[PDB]
Amino acid sequence: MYGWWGRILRVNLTTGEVKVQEYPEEVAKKFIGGRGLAAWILWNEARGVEPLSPENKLIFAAGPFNGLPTPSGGKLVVAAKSPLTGGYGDGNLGTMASVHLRRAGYDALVVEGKAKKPVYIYIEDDNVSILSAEGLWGKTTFETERELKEIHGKNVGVLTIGPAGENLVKYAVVISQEGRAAGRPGMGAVMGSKKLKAVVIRGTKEIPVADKEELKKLSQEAYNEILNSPGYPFWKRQGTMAAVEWCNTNYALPTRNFSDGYFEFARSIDGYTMEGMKVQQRGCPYCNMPCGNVVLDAEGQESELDYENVALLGSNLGIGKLNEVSVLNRIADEMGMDTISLGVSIAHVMEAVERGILKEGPTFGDFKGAKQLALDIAYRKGELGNLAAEGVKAMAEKLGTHDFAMHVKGLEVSGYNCYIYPAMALAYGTSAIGAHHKEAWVIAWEIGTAPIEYKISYDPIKAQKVVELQRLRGGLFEMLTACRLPWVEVGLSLDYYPKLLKAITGVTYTWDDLYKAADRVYSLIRAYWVREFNGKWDRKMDYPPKRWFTEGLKSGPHKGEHLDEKKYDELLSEYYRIRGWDERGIPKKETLKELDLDFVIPELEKVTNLE
Amino acid sequence: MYGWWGRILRVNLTTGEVKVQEYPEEVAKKFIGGRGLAAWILWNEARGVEPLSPENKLIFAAGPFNGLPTPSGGKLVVAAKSPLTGGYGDGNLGTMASVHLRRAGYDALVVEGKAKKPVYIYIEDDNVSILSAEGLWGKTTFETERELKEIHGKNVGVLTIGPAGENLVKYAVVISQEGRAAGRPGMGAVMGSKKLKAVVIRGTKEIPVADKEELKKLSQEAYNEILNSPGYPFWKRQGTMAAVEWCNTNYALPTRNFSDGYFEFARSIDGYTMEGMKVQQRGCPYCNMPCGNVVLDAEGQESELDYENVALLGSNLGIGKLNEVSVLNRIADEMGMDTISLGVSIAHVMEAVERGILKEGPTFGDFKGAKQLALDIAYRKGELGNLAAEGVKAMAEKLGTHDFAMHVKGLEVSGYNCYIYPAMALAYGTSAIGAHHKEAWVIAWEIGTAPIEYKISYDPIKAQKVVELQRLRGGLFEMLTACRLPWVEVGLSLDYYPKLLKAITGVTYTWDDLYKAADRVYSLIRAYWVREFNGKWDRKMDYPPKRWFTEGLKSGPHKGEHLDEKKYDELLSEYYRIRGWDERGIPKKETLKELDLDFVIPELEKVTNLE
Ligand code: SF4
Ligand code: SF4
């Protein structure tokens, strides 16, 4: 076997047992890695488990591209049954831990059980130990990684959780290298529930490559193509922050809990403003187009800015000064909580306060109040911090505020306001893990323009475009696993991927093979949700928030415009037709058989009727 | 006598003598105060003196508006014979020193002589002393003022020089409250040449007012008019920083030593970027429309930004990040040196380096090199730093780089590139103290738009507009002395001024009375220059820099356009006709008699032939 090790590191925190599981080359070829491998593991090992119980499996899954010098191939997938959504949950982050896990001889790391006290997992090739982290517990993510490196050396990959993870904030994430984050659906809370403070990894092994020279050649070509792309200069300057102006121009910038798609103060929180306050730039392993832009916040502290962070903690909160939004951003990284769900939870509180629903709490534009709430959420201080720490779905159940609860499947909607964007609304509605733009950022195509540089339509071809994008963004890139931005942003040819894959693994994958592996992952993931939800499931699970159907844009040429539910419903049926799912969004028996998921049928039938 | 004290504090640092000069009420009425009073004093007391010798007079002149609660009436004029230009030199700054000097019982303070060692002047009502400042010498302006208040208390007004003043940098200024500056033509160097490190002032006396009730009424109306003006909100947000975009849009933003009027990276150093970096907002005494916008620079330090500072230290130097420009800005303030002349001098060096004329030094866009040169100028360290510390006129004589030496009469050109703006070019050409936009910011009217919110033309009305603006901006406002921005930016009515002047002094001044006093000051100032130049004077003294006639814009729909020498010369003759001046730029015997300036006739006749 080349590329894949066929090895998965297993750590049981309850028993202290550490072992290496060998999985068949057939499974590796069939699921490829990252999310695929994770979905296979969770389907088999997390049936009916409580997300915060010792039985949940915390998975760190790499893929064949990882550990090797592949173009922006320093990504890693973190997965577990989600404490926020109750379904399959995952996330991705660039981190040296990805390079080291693979160079240490493993394709993935699976943590089960729960330690008796705070501990961290140490991995140096074949030497794996569960060590006491009593001294680290309570420290920020930044401080935890800094201290671990002060002991073991700079040459290690470190994954940590901060107080939000330790306190089981439902959208707590895993942090690496002060800025890289993974696991919006609460991977950080699953990590915290096991009393797992960090993971330190070092690898030195040579990963067996089927064609060393092709690999080295293809990689050099791709790097050069990136360096020579016309978008490279502007990408180097603004990175994802170029989307603030682009979204504002197109009425897609979430403003005041998604109330409007335009923000009057977007310029003072945009990419140009960011350029003027940038002090450093860093990136993920093996990437020659770094986009981790670091600024100084209002308190003079370094903060790494990404578009989503700014959109959800800036315009979405009615906060118009980038230096202030940057303080909130830093807090999220330090505490280890998702900037998106954090911002949407805060915005939800702000709307409830302005409406008189909540007697106390911050209002839109209130930076000091937003900062205090962010901190109270991470430390679960007071009734408000505790409520908001649960996310908008849970919070809305308690407050009767479902009308303005911006989420899909319990996962908070990200940085694109879709009052007039049917395809993007469908992307959020059908995202495998819950509302996220990860799997299909189709709004650009719907508009005809993109950040590096209108008539509302429900054409069934939009459902086809979303499935196509999900195959690449929610499948391929989450399985390799590698950054999708070189392709998305600078236009690196997708042809490099199946070639790099054969050069590495020696297996020839055609685009249809890849499209099929991605579809298998999608149906398996959906199957997981259906099974864990005990068959209680229908098409409404794939609907975007009610706000986009009952309210419209508040300003500009498109004022009053919104989504037509009837037409959205028809577009959803088209999505199901293309995926081979029934009108409830559940995979059909024939579809499962065709995707080599026969094993799913018996289990799903114990819970509902299949078609 | 009301309003005016009719008293001038006299401090001789050579003899240690402190006395109070009582001057005539008719002189007070005739010159009003500020620059008018200063020009009267310099004509009489700085005849033929070397600017850096003990005989030069350093004047801190206030007017009837000062010390009283008048709308933005906390300004102060600092004047002396200029070490940079060799003629009349002055500047203005907002400072509690203004309020305290007048409440202490004086209309002005005149310092003559030179101390044997560093000293500071201490003024508390009638108690005035020259005290040792040996421990303060060498400290920054910020630290000097901070330490003085730690001794004397926070309720004092303080004026200081930093190392640039101490080291006689030709464009050294006087600084107050970390950000307020005065005296571009080297007032700081004059102060430093006297070994005067600072002036600390405290006043408690009630200033006699003709009509206290009218004064209170008018000020209140004016304050409310400011608060309710349509421009108030945007002014509060961006202040003068709104000019970066306005100038860039109009090809008037000095870029790379005025090479072009358009900067490709203007957005990253503009007013919106500043808003996203603002952490504090300060202002001058008695102002309800504060514009001292404080940001954190690239090193996390506070830096108060003004348009000119950013245009001359940013676009003019090819530096496109506001955080970096802010480091240069803070250095200028700390060292006590003019941001404009500093930037124009650094830009001059950058062009000479690029052109190979200088073999060592910073080039455009080199922030680290610019910072090092700014520090070397302040401390006069090295041949290059010592040369640039002399100003562009002097530096150009040594390097043979007159072609790109942007100055008029030795004073560096400010933040408006006039390749296609004849009236603004004439404003710079005729400015009483040398190149400055202070006396006539006519570019706004020439274009038809303003920052608060084209066809070239040499229409003789342009000269009439420059004269009208000079009467107000270089006359009235420099004599009161009060901020001209409420009127300029927010549209406060000019009708308040004659009414407040009457309520204060009891003397009624019709607009014609004020225009005559302003022209009187302009002709007296002109007479001072001619006299001091020993009659060596002609119309070329009032010409804009050669570059605006010799080259044109480098981009935009106006690419290649420049000023025309013949049409400019005709426009200048129109300016002379309106002012009653020779074709050499010297007042006519009839004009001098007209303005009650007969005493200057004998003096000018001794040096040249009058008309
Ligand atoms: S483009 Fe950005 S997110 Fe992608 S690998 Fe590079 S630094 Fe990481
Ligand atoms: S408008 Fe600005 S410069 Fe004028 S008095 Fe007010 S704070 Fe000072």
Kindly summarize this structure in a few lines.
This is part of a larger assembly, with two copies of chain A (611 residues). In chain A, 41% of the residues lie in helices and 13% in strands.
Name some characteristics of this structure.
six-stranded mixed beta sheet, Aldehyde Ferredoxin Oxidoreductase,  A, domain 1, alpha+beta, globular, four-stranded mixed beta sheet, Aldehyde Ferredoxin Oxidoreductase Protein, subunit A, domain 3, 2 chains, 26 helices, 611 residues, part of a larger assembly, 13% strand, binds iron/sulfur cluster, 17 strands, Aldehyde Ferredoxin Oxidoreductase Protein, subunit A, domain 2, 3 domains
Please describe the topology of this protein.
This is part of a larger assembly, with 2 copies of chain A (611 residues).
Chain A: E1 7-12, E2 18-22, H1 25-31, H2 34-45, E3 58-61, E4 75-81, E5 88-94, H3 96-103, E6 108-112, E7 119-124, E8 127-132, H4 141-152, E9 157-160, H5 163-166, E10 174-176, E11 180-182, H6 187-193, E12 196-202, H7 212-227, H8 232-238, H9 243-249, H10 271-275, E13 278-282, E14 292-296, E15 302-305, H11 307-313, H12 322-335, H13 339-354, H14 367-379, H15 382-388, H16 392-399, E16 407-408, E17 411-412, H17 422-430, H18 443-447, H19 461-480, H20 485-490, H21 496-505, H22 511-532, H23 547-550, H24 565-579, H25 589-594, H26 600-605
Parallel strand pairs in A: 1-6, 7-12
Antiparallel strand pairs in A: 1-2, 3-4, 3-6, 4-5, 7-8, 9-12, 10-11, 13-14, 14-15, 16-17
Helix pairs in contact in A: 1-2, 2-19, 2-22, 7-21, 11-13, 12-14, 14-15, 17-19, 19-22, 19-24
